Symmetry: D2
Subunit: 355 residues, 4 copies
């Protein structure tokens, strides 16, 4: 168990940006700018800084050329400059490795703290950031598939309860989770900004980054991303969806970038900002929990995820999950799922839904 520090937690506003290491900056640019339409805040020969349509902070995504594709930092903005001090004291008490840079790690961010957190993830906390033109009314630029906000991160970690307690102490509130009747937790979702999630934990071998998620305005915008990928004859990079989630209630899609970093497109979850927001727990065998329409979850969604780096830029060692596997208990040879609890009709034994 990760202890609760005496030191006060920093006041975290929201997920703000991810730094992803990519192997071929031009191929990555083509995906994120030409295919997906993200907006360039800054670029050079080593990095591309990208933002969503409604963003005013400098960026939501930094693509950094490197030898090994991986998550380098998942950054959360805090409420005040003093909250970066609070973050530093909090993680030091946790016994975590930290590094503070008054002029930032990436362009457009000022005083920033990176940490190797108790789950092995590279978290950044910052307040100071360079404001840019907020493009929210630039309908002359708006794409039929426009990505309008950064919504969340999702982390693969082997022990979900352990991670959950730590994030709650940090001020994240759990909104939804997946458990079974034998005391196992498979996943949890947790927030600061008053949507379903700013980050989320998926049970599995980790630390690995499961995905970064961007929002659209409407469901047809997600449909258009699929249609465009069909026209570009890259439909093989559509991993899963489009669908309606059970957990979160959002319309969604998962696609794969050139380094197999997974990107979710997401819209129309609900408000969670009240402190007694009702927590929703799904059973792992409920075939409407991940896709509300019962569409099967492809095995790659459970097994594949991105490496993460430590503060020296080296890949974190992966620790094996020993708790039961969501893949195995739902779609593996001895798995089970149901449509209606207690009804044999519409249940699946040893296979995925829909044939």
């Amino acid at each position: 168990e990760i202890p609760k520090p005496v030191a006060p937690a920093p006041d975290i506003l929201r997920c703000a940006y991810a730094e992803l290491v990519v192997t071929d900056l031009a191929k990555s640019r083509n995906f994120y700018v030409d295919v997906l339409g993200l907006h360039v805040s800054y670029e050079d020969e080593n990095q591309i800084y990208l933002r969503s349509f409604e963003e005013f902070i400098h960026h939501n995504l930094v693509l950094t050329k490197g030898p090994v594709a991986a998550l380098k930092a998942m950054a959360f903005r805090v409420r005040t400059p003093e909250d970066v001090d609070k973050a530093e004291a909090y993680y030091q008490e946790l016994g975590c490795r930290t590094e503070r840079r008054k002029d930032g790690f990436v362009k457009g961010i000022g005083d920033a703290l990176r940490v190797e957190d108790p789950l092995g993830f590279p978290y950044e906390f910052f307040f100071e950031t360079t404001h840019v033109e907020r493009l929210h009314m630039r309908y002359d630029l708006y794409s039929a598939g426009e990505l309008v906000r950064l919504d969340h991160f999702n982390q693969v970690t082997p022990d979900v309860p352990r991670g959950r307690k730590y994030l709650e102490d940090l001020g994240f509130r759990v909104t939804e989770d997946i458990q079974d009747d034998e005391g196992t937790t498979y996943a949890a979702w947790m927030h600061r900004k008053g949507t379903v999630q700013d980050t989320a934990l998926t049970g599995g071998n980790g630390p690995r980054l499961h995905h970064v998620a961007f929002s659209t305005h409407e469901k047809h915008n997600i449909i258009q991303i699929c249609d465009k990928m069909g026209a570009l004859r890259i439909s093989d990079r559509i991993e899963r969806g489009p669908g309606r989630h059970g957990v979160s209630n959002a319309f969604y899609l998962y696609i794969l970038d050139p380094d197999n970093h997974r990107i979710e497109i997401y819209t129309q979850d609900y408000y969670t900002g009240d402190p007694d927001n009702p927590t929703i727990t799904w059973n792992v065998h409920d075939n409407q929990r991940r896709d509300w329409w019962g569409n099967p979850v492809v095995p790659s969604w459970y097994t594949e995820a991105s490496k993460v780096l430590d503060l020296d830029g080296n890949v974190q060692e992966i620790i094996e999950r020993t708790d039961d596997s969501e893949l195995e208990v739902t779609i593996g040879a001895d798995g089970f799922s149901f449509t209606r609890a207690g009804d044999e009709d519409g249940s699946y034994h040893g296979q995925a839904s829909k044939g």
Copy 2:
């Protein structure tokens, strides 16, 4: 081959309605009225007559209680009363069994001809029908999943070229098809009304009815049907989709009624009314041909379809396809498909996609 009659073909306007035999009328009512929101044109203890939001003819669907669920008739509206006579002469010349009822087979249809067509399907041709309130501006009745038009039928038949030529002789024009390099035809789509299809042929054991399709206004209306089915905890009756079709370019969904009759929801195909409308042929191994996004086609979509009846109400015997199977050549053990022709990356062998 089915020879072309010397008798002139009836002038067919469009698909108009289907009569489905159902085993439990109340359960079927629940599905078509309460889940799907179709509008009641007439009902009693034996039948429910239903129409879409924009329809002015009496109905687009008749649910008839009976012992064995099946298609009883797929009905096309013809241009004039005289076209019913032309239909009778045409099918008589083909040597088909016909039945003419001057006052109709179902309520709200007048003079009507039913035939056991050369592919074993029960076709009806009629002109006269009772007009009803056209609900196209009744937004006080509009559902979040509103079904707005009847769009098409899809028939399973063993020899697609044979059926295609017969339908061409009847004035249907092929818009799209699926073939391979060996010259096998797996499916064809063909129209009268100036959309992609009024009926369609799927290669397989037949005669069987693959589906009846209704359209929505927008893609979100199809999404809502899925969402509603999840809320009703009947997501197991979502068979395939939602998706974008390759063939037709329509946004689509397939669902299953209480007797396993398959219903497609469909929107936003394209205009085909010019007589030189370009015909599109897809390769059977193209994994974007059926679902443009490359999502796999579940085997039940290829293998399962509804029985059809003869004019006595008995189930039509089935003839097994001898041409190659689309299922087998794409997703079966010796099948394959591609994302990009000639590229092993994104190809699938002995396996479906994704």
Copy 3:
């Protein structure tokens, strides 16, 4: 206008308009950069444009000239022989015709242009150069994509006279607007099984009221408005967006650099059955044009494009003598209602929603 003995040509649909424009570059910016139409051909004299789902060569030809005007509204006919039928039909009507075996504009073959009995330059053709049908080119699809040509709309002074002539030509009336004293203000009529291929608006004419393009969805029309706001050209949004009464379509009217009016349109209904029910609206029904009762801007009733004769000269305007829709609905002596017979929700001497004429 008498019904010829000669058979009418079999008309499939509206197919394209040729508009004369004064500044080709400014017109290009509007139709290509703002509206996203697709270039089939262009040079210093003309720009040929098509919608997303079209396979014929073009739906719009922009021709540089001194005086902005409609030069031709073109209908495609079913067979080559129907061009001969059109020629014989209009000759019997006593109309001026011109036949060009190799077309008037690029990508059209054998074509007949006529100065029709209402003074409009109609073209009939079958032969056209097929192009890449872009209907699945989602790599090109814009948030405001125009997917088809839907219809034309013509200003003419005597609507019944025009209606009868178009009925003889094979168009079928779907909807109209009349009053209780027997005046007709507008009529809509079709060949292709939608609400309209052309339409008549009562007023001084011949003038071209608009050309209409379709979108897939209502949000595509909303995006056009949003984009025009972002470009700071919201003053070129004339009217809308709205829901029509007549046609039931979602709509918008915008103005090109020469004030040619373009409608964007979606989700009208099927009309292909021969006994398709006609719908007649009362002129005082404030839901007939905008279903939500939003006021119809006066320019919509007064402004429209000049049309040319076959020499390229502007057609003389003939004044409407029947009552004016503007005057009887939104002028100082006008009225409209929300519910027939109800004073609540009625408007007298002004438009709906609190406005009078500017």
Copy 4:
């Protein structure tokens, strides 16, 4: 100027519900339930309690039968029980009348404080509320026009800077405003929950309630409300819209209930939760500021609004605005608006846009 109390401000979460007095409860029920599709939490012969599709607190709207239609309370939820005490101390320090009911003023609310605020508005602060079934996945109930959340209130008040400062001290941050070049503020928008607004100030004679706003998921849901009102032949109850706002960037519609209470339908504004969120100031003469497409703002939008009650249930006296009128300076006889700053072309002098004048 309203002074900043020494006492700490309550921590306000969000707007939570309004109580509207209505004259004919059945007619009001038909509007809010049958026309608009709000979900009944409770009703009797005197009150109807309604919530939106995604709500889990007891209600977002209470309709209370009474002799004079008016706003009775605009209610904000606070973060903790202790924040109700803080609200009481805060308003007392401001010299405002307060009333505390341990078991609530309306059903499904617990310990609650109502106040006559410094602008004459009846505010409620509460934490405790009865949870109900959250209908957010009840797609079997979902309407083509479904109202999914309560979004905001909008208040008419004569002195916008005076109100703005008071609300800022209370912790609301201004996200957008409308000013001119002569020092006049015509309107301001301010939030707690991280959308553009939880409440808003519109310059005018007040206190009056301008509107209550509900959100939809998508723009087509707003269009459906319009379409349905046409089918019901109540298009005369569509006041303004649908449109795209400049301020807020939301797609919108304004409609009028049976007592002329104005309801906004709203979707797809942007995130404001960062504390340095950029404040956007529009010039009052910019004809894209209220409707981005330049559609004219109907004069009733500027002149009509609902009465508000004091804690005794009597109507609050109206105080006249002396600052310049947005109506007058934009669409009135000496008004002006532009499409492009400094361009005569597309400007409007002494009339509205798109060919209209004031009736």
